[PDB]
Amino acid sequence: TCDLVGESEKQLALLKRLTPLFQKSFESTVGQSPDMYSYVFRVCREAGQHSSGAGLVQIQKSNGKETVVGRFNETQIFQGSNWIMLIYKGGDEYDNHCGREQRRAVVMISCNRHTLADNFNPVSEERGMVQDCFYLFEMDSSLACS
Amino acid sequence: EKTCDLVGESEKQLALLKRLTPLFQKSFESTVGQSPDMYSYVFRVCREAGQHSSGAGLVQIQKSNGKETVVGRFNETQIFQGSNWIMLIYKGGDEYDNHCGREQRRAVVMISCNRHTLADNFNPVSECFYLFEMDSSLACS
Ligand SMILES: *[C@@H]1O[C@H](CO)[C@@H](O)[C@H](O)[C@H]1NC(C)=O
Ligand SMILES: O=P(O)(O)OC[C@@H](O)CO
Ligand SMILES: O=P(O)(O)OC[C@@H](O)CO
């Protein structure tokens, strides 16, 4: 399961508030041909098929190259008025961008009082996230409501 | 005449900045903590926040003596729009003295869609990086 970065029982409780999503699998594909990437995200569970401990991976559809965007063994989580921010650090280092630092995944879970979990997608396409050196994603969930 | 300076430029982020102009003139504030250690957070969109912090977009004010600590500068701005929320980031703040590796402070502000107010309810979420939030119909789409 998710391992908190650092004990903030506040974040611990939050991981528990999110367990109803652990077994679900979210995917979103952005961009057009030659050039199309598929993002697979999971909550405190393996997201890739060639990785270990990946929380969110990027898959180049042209050749299936799977890049780890963030790991759930380095999780951070915060709760706003009607959203929950989930962060997965320790992803693969950029090859020739953003100072070759480790990739990081940020998922903004917005309160949606009519779905337990739905509409996951990057806040991009893949020709903008790398430019901004920020993998920002979003999804809906009543779990993010308060 | 100094406005937000996009980090890095990204006509999408420049458009978002224009979309947020109605807030430039407004002032946001929220106080946390109990005497005598209360802090006041002042936030402004593409304008200066405190009274003694040039280029500061968001400042932490010690209510006891008014000492200002810069959390983020609007000349190192980043902005993203999701579906029913806009994220505003201000970097280049005063570096920590004994925390986060002396690391320059950063301000992350989650502007949530609220169809019933142009701007309101600004307050910190948690105090690395400082996470804040507020409501605005401008973040509604
Ligand atoms: C998280 O897992 C990665 C991959 O094995 C590893 O390199 C890193 O040291 C781990 N970090 C923690 C929190 O143990
Ligand atoms: O297709 P996504 O956006 O990943 O949502 C899947 C979820 O509805 C499965 O229960
Ligand atoms: O109290 P805050 O959150 O700073 O909002 C003030 C704003 O409503 C003034 O027009």
Curated annotation (Swiss-Prot), chain B:
GO biological process, one term: secretion of lysosomal enzymes
Domain MRH: 2-141
Lumenal face residues: 1-141
Subcellular location: Lysosome membrane
Topology within the bilayer: Single-pass type I membrane protein
Cysteines joined through disulfide linkages: 4-46, 100-128, 113-140
GO cellular component labels: endosome; Golgi apparatus; late endosome; lysosomal membrane; perinuclear region of cytoplasm; trans-Golgi network
A GO term for molecular function: retromer complex binding
Top-rank lineage group of the source organism: Eukaryota
Keywords from the named record: Disulfide bond, Glycoprotein, Lysosome, Membrane, Phosphoprotein, Receptor, Signal, Transmembrane, Transmembrane helix, Transport
Sugar-modified residues: 25, 51, 62, 75, 81
Protein's job: Transport of phosphorylated lysosomal enzymes from the Golgi complex and the cell surface to lysosomes. Lysosomal enzymes bearing phosphomannosyl residues bind specifically to mannose-6-phosphate receptors in the Golgi apparatus and the resulting receptor-ligand complex is transported to an acidic prelyosomal compartment where the low pH mediates the dissociation of the complex.
Subunit structure: Homodimer. Interacts with GGA1, GGA2 and GGA3.
Entry remark concerning the domains of this protein: The extracellular domain is homologous to the repeating units (of approximately 147 AA) of the cation-independent mannose 6-phosphate receptor.
Miscellaneous: This receptor has optimal binding in the presence of divalent cations.
Name of the protein described by the UniProt record: Cation-dependent mannose-6-phosphate receptor
Organism: Bos taurus (Bovine)
